[PDB]
Amino acid sequence: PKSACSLVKPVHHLVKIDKSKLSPRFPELKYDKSDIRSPGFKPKDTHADRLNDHYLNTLQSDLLLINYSHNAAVVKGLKQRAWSGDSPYHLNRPPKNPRGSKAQLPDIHPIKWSNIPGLESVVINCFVREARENQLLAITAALQLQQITGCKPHPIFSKNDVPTWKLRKGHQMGAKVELKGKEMSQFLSTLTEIVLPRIREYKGISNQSGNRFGGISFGLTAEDIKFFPEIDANQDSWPKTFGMHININTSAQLDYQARTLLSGFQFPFFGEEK
């Protein structure tokens, strides 16, 4: 290479251009994934979803009535603070970091018809620490996530290095699966219907849990996963079972909106809120 200097030449037209469509290679990526002609095609609306229907029928209008605050206003989040102009050194100064945090926080809008707290995704995190020695056990995690969730599990490999823990970087230990749409709805339903009402000392999901801006997480122990229908049927072929982490992502702006929302899908809460 004669030089390393990136400089894109400006154009003389407004027409948006995309070299993918006019390159003869890969004639099958040109078709959309949803298109029937694509080899990546997969039907989406195979059957109706009961949980989604419930939310759209009953919980939709109810939540709008619950969260409504009369003549509420947008609460701006902690953004970067500009430099007051009183010295000749502020002309190119980067702005200050937010007041109490090093990361900007989002705004909170009043709840209206367009924005009503609703589900969007569910992520299952499974980190088998014991895989440090026996890698073969990590495969059992992917099968467990596959059988239960019903979707392809994306594997989890190490990223850090803690010698005190015999942890080595660059080894497979677990699997994760992103769930959306009807399949997520089935998982959430079968979790509250079957698995949850089978723990002896179960009290519910802690009110302290949850990211500040939407998102609620809890965890299932090793023995709780035996309660799933697809392991209970073949206990012989499941000698070893182990826990996982659950994270429910929702359109709730704040946590307390999400907790009210998830309660409509038969989720209990026990602790005291912040």
Partner: protein, 296 residues
């Protein structure tokens, strides 16, 4: 008009005046360039023609010009003979086609065309045009205009009088007119007597009727009759129709009916087992001699 090297050294590509400037397209980026002239402001207006420099000069000396014209890339020098041989091969093919067209025009037909060479050249161009994707109306004009060209141009370069151009253009007009109304090509780029479109439709229907009623092909004489019907079919059928009709009627293996399939006699071709998915069992279909077009 400036470059950059491995060491990020900036160097000029053309003679000019070096100016340091800032391009509004790239804020927070200083620039260096080379304006082609002193009075030129380097951040040239975006929507104005770029200021280029030809630089290279013309070779006035006769010997220098001769050397340069006769100087070609090794690719061209090595490909010089092969391309010429192919040109000679195709020229011979054109010559043979011209000879064949003239023979059929005078012998197979009895048209007295005054200009043999002009008539043949028009037709060979029409045939080549028709071979390529071209409707009949376009093909005839394309050849017609071509000939009428190289005649207005010839008049200009040879300083011909207007009358000479007019008579030559008129002469081309009539010969093409006569050729169009008296000659045509039949589904294979072969010259033959003109056939009207309406007549073509009438003949096509007659053939379709004459071919439908005789589709049993029981006896070799019928086979000959069907094949005989497919002799002048090219005159009034396009290639797509011609191939389709043959596939429908000239079937290599005829449908298996009671007469065609039988086991009482021996040497019924061969067993020819297939599979049926209704009964999920292998079947034996011994075909008879009068079930194959090749043998019958």
């Amino acid at each position: 008009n400036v470059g950059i090297g491995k060491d990020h050294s900036i160097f000029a590509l053309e003679p000019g005046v070096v100016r340091y400037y800032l391009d509004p397209f790239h804020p927070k980026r200083k620039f260096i360039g080379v304006a082609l002239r002193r009075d030129l402001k380097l951040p040239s207006p975006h929507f104005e023609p770029t200021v280029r420099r030809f630089g290279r000069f013309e070779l006035t000396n006769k010997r220098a010009a001769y050397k340069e014209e006769n100087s070609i890339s090794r690719k061209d020098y090595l490909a010089k003979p092969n391309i010429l041989k192919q040109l000679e091969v195709r020229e011979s093919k054109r010559k043979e086609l011209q000879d064949k067209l003239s023979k059929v025009l005078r012998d197979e037909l009895k048209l007295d065309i005054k200009d043999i060479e002009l008539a043949t050249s028009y037709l060979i161009r029409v045939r080549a045009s028709l071979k390529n994707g071209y409707p009949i109306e376009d093909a005839r004009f394309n050849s017609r205009y071509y000939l009428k060209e190289e005649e207005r141009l010839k008049a200009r370069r040879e300083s011909w009088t207007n009358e000479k151009l007019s008579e030559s253009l008129s002469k081309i007009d009539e010969c093409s007119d006569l050729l169009n109304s008296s000659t045509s090509f039949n589904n294979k780029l072969e010259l033959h007597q003109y056939i009207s479109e309406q007549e073509k439709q009438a003949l096509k229907a007659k053939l379709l009727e004459d071919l439908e009623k005789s589709q049993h092909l029981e006896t070799k004489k019928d086979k000959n009759y069907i094949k005989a019907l497919f002799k002048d079919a090219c005159n009034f059928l396009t290639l797509s129709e011609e191939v389709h009709l043959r596939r429908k009627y000239l079937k290599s293996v005829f449908p298996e009916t009671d007469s065609t399939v039988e086991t009482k006699s021996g040497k019924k071709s061969i067993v020819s087992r297939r599979f049926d998915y209704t009964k999920n069992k292998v079947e034996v279909i011994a075909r008879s001699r009068r079930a194959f077009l090749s043998k019958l």
